[PDB]
Symmetry: C3
Subunit: 452 residues, 3 copies
């Protein structure tokens, strides 16, 4: 039989905020179990250092730049989204006989054609925008008050959740709610001859910082208020993963299920997170912004107790899942990742002599990153290109560009070459951001790929 696949994605999870990736203060035993009896990844990179584009990339297998999705969708709502001509991994799997489910955060389009149920997800339970308030007792009264005033543009963090299009009245803390529905999904899946795919998109530990008192009580030694709340949010995810894991064991699903656990981007230091030993955090092209924790777990298939030290991209998940599912992939889909399993099993670099990119736009310029073999190229804050031996210098403290001029110049030029089929953005997260984009003649790649 072909394996079941679960992709679990935390939102704004810091590099050092789970036990298996070095957390000395937050405790995540159920997630750590999956690590201990599976393989974790010390060099795992998402395709963009924040949510919308990173998630677009997970589902499509393409850098968000190639499909006009370089920015988060408009915060106050919109009728646009990740283009429909890039087939989602869920759609492909559904076409090769998988029962498909998506839970929690979407952030890839509110309209009918961009909805999870038209991107190849049989079941969906969650909220369509960038995040959500965690307590129904807080958020449902506010929404009711505003809808009765006649307002149509309501902040999406307080709007109702939905199940396959129809609104619901959620009763639990959201992290637990999604965990409950993850159980319900795998339970529904037992009564089918088909294998299953589940995209579990937790909004924790993303703002707003809201945790159950019961979870926070587990971290009495954490004296900082925001960090303690953050910790409780993360522990709530861990309880969920443990609850899912039990349901999988109960159903004899555990053994033929590949579980991936990761973050969508780096942690935000001002909102409770820790990215040790990486520099900076969310949104940055420093390692802190797009290098994330990740583990695979699949008994008798994924090695137990290993730590894989070569680069892996979130882009690889698409063709990798497809190869494991026996689903055909077409050359016209323009996948930017690679099926990493053959290299993974031989403990070899799946991106041997090949770059992994990050390009994030700012006001009138762009920050960039390149990861190839031991090297990390970095363009940030309008400075000249720096270069790091990232294997010796994970914190990016020692720029060795002066003694590798030819190598750095080469990497940047390859990025310049790669840039040409990037589409103009189909939207921006705010109206003024698009106005400034047009005003500044963006992209200003003359600044971005100038060399020393």
């Amino acid at each position: 039989q072909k394996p079941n696949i679960i992709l679990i994605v935390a939102d704004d999870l810091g590099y050092a905020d789970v036990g298996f990736n070095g957390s000395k203060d937050i405790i995540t035993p159920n997630i750590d179990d999956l690590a201990k009896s599976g393989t974790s990844f010390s060099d795992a990179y998402v395709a963009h250092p924040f949510s919308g584009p990173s998630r677009a990339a997970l589902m499509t297998g393409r850098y968000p730049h190639k499909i006009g999705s370089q920015f988060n969708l408009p915060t106050r709502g919109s009728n646009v989204g990740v283009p429909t001509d890039a087939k989602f991994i869920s759609k492909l799997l559904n076409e090769n006989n998988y029962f498909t489910g998506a839970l929690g955060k979407w952030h890839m389009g509110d309209t009918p054609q961009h909805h999870p149920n038209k991107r190849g997800f049989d079941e969906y339970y969650g909220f369509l925008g960038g995040g959500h308030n965690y307590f129904p007792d807080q958020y449902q009264p506010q929404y009711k008050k505003q809808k009765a005033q006649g307002l149509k543009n309501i902040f999406e963090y307080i709007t109702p959740l939905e199940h396959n299009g129809k609104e619901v009245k959620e009763t639990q803390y959201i992290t637990d709610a999604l965990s409950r529905e993850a159980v319900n999904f795998v339970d529904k899946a037992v009564n089918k001859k088909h294998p299953f795919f589940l995209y579990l998109a937790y909004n924790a530990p993303h703002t707003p910082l809201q945790a159950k008192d019961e979870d926070m009580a587990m971290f009495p030694n954490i004296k900082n208020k925001d960090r303690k709340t953050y910790a409780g949010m993360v522990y709530a995810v861990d309880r969920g993963v443990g609850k899912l894991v039990e349901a999988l064991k109960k159903n004899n699903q555990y053994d033929n299920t590949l579980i991936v656990f990761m973050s969508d981007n780096g942690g935000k230091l001002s909102k409770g997170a820790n990215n040790f030993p990486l520099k900076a955090g969310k949104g940055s092209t420093q390692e802190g912004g797009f290098r994330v924790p990740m583990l695979f777990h699949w008994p008798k298939h994924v090695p137990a107790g290993k730590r894989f030290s070569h680069p892996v991209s979130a882009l690889d998940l698409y063709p990798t899942f497809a190869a494991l599912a026996g689903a055909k992939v077409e050359e016209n889909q323009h996948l930017d990742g690679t099926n990493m399993w053959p290299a993974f099993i031989k403990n070899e670099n799946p991106h041997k002599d090949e770059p992994i990119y990050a390009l994030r736009h700012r006001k009138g310029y762009s920050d960039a990153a390149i990861r190839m073999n031991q090297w990390k190229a970095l363009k940030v804050n309008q400075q000249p290109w720096q270069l790091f031996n990232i294997e010796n210098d994970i914190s990016e403290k020692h720029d060795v560009s002066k003694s590798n001029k030819a190598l750095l110049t080469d990497m940047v030029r390859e990025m310049e070459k790669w840039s040409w089929d990037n589409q103009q953005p189909s939207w921006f997260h705010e109206t003024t951001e698009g106005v400034n984009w047009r005003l500044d003649a963006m992209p200003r790649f003359d600044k971005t790929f100038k060399t020393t």
Copy 2:
């Protein structure tokens, strides 16, 4: 049997320039007959306050902004047009067994793929551009003189008319010519088992101001020269409508034919028109620019002698005609109107708690309008957003924004939300307009949707 449908569209007809919509000086008895034995609309809105985009919207059922058609086509000619992937209502009806005809003004593309005969019209007789000179005795000598000089770029107002692609030598005043062919069309239609659709696009009373002496003689009390000519132009349309009506009765078509009569946009005050009691006129986002006269007539179906006081959009005609014809509509067509018939028959607002928009671009900024229930939001002349209780204040004299800040802000934000899937314009009416568009980083929606 499914009903025949006639859509009659005057060009630049003022709000107060037909008898049934309050004209004290111009007399339109045959059009008034249709009103008296049918229902007129006091709150009827086109999708854009001038021709090309408004007509694009009629045919496609979509706001012109969504399909890159926010501007009139180049005045001196072009090889572009209303995109071919938006199925015209004529095409849909033709596919559900209707005999289709288009007469008069097109203004939606000169090229073969944009031609009426490829947009689902079996018969077409008219001129493809923005308007035409009215007297063949004046215009045919000028065209002949210029073609013999060897000139290829001839002002489209003097070029020959055509019938299904072949040129003709028209003998009558154009308003009468089109009326004659409207008779010919419905006559041709009797000898078929099919019902029929007719889009009669009069160019009257659009410039240039040219009328028959016989028509002007009917308005001896009109002392102003331009208004008298204008009046004669409008009376000529009325004669045409009466002539069509006779032919329909002669053929036992009258009783199972829905006739819609309306304008493409508001009247232009400097070229003879009157928009009483509305403010401003053609091209404005004030009511005068996009609120137009309209009547439905269909015996034993449309109430006789009524005046419907709730909002209706030209966008509604597409799905409304389709529902009456029993033609299926697909979610992928992205229709922006609603089938208004169910609400119409119950005398309810078909756009209850839903906005009707107008957005018209200017040099480096945009004017806008929102109509929802009793409210009219207005952005004009780079002023702050104003708000009107349009039911009490049709002339837009009393801005009540200060005492409804939350409501106004809400409406504007919904318009901001709606703006995101507007395409960049595929053309402009002049070369400099596109240059200025690019220079000004348009759209400048940061100005257009800023709130107080």
Copy 3:
């Protein structure tokens, strides 16, 4: 039987640099033989005054502007190219039973979908970018040194040649190498029931100026160093044409083969060329930049010893070849040329009362050209539109605009009309060129089509 077709294209060949088009110093007897027993063209125009766009136009039959290909591809590499939805003439011919081959320079896209083997060429031997170093003994050591350093972005002029996707180690001077493979191609073609199409794209006499000592020895009277080298480069092409011609005769192919020989654009005066009697050279909208030498040769079909004096466009080759091959052409392909054979055989103007355009972009403005009947309109160097009787004034010395105001204005307005379906460029030859394009709000057609 339908005829074999060979299209031979020199790169940067000057107007006066072959014997049959007036060369007093360079000697080209084998090319001259084809002229003497065929027809040469005194008014032959490519679609754009430099390589990439001109070649795109040859293959697609469309002005490069219509398909976003107005510029040369990025010099340092890219993953974009001539769009795949414009069917190449090679593809059409392959679909109507032709054995297809492409040799030498491509300059129309490095990626798999843009590769010659996916644009309808069975065989390809050459280099994919803008040109190449001529001596393997010089270029192969440099490439080997750089590949061993680990560099991935290597100047394309020193990279290996390829044969149907696999790299090769070429042993000869490139002009001779391509000539040898042209022989190999026509030889392979004998053993097939099919006729054949061959696109022989010499990079000579394009930079860098490198010739065999043996060739240069034939021009001892040429005292200038660059001109002597240039001459040797051109003689090497002539040897190749003679070698191909022998192989064709050997195989009884000569008599039922249409050979076309031409340049991709005008000669560059600073790199050895001569465009007498034309003004300026490569890249200009003066005649020197896009009026090129051309001959047809096809015994008992093309008249022997004639000089055809009416305009012909490179755009005509597509439908002309197609008509001779009996291959159907569709209206949806939007071909911008005409099948010129019927007019050619009657010694009539195939573009009678129809313009041939050239539009080349510069820093914040564009130069333009129009050729119709005896007239040449010219916009250059930000000057006002000039007009020339090009039949009496081939060097463009006598502007007669003042006494033909109406005619000039007409031509320009038709060009303005033609401009509207030009696509925004899908790429530029350098990063800064695209930045400057966006900064300058290009195209600035308000400057380009302003009239007096």
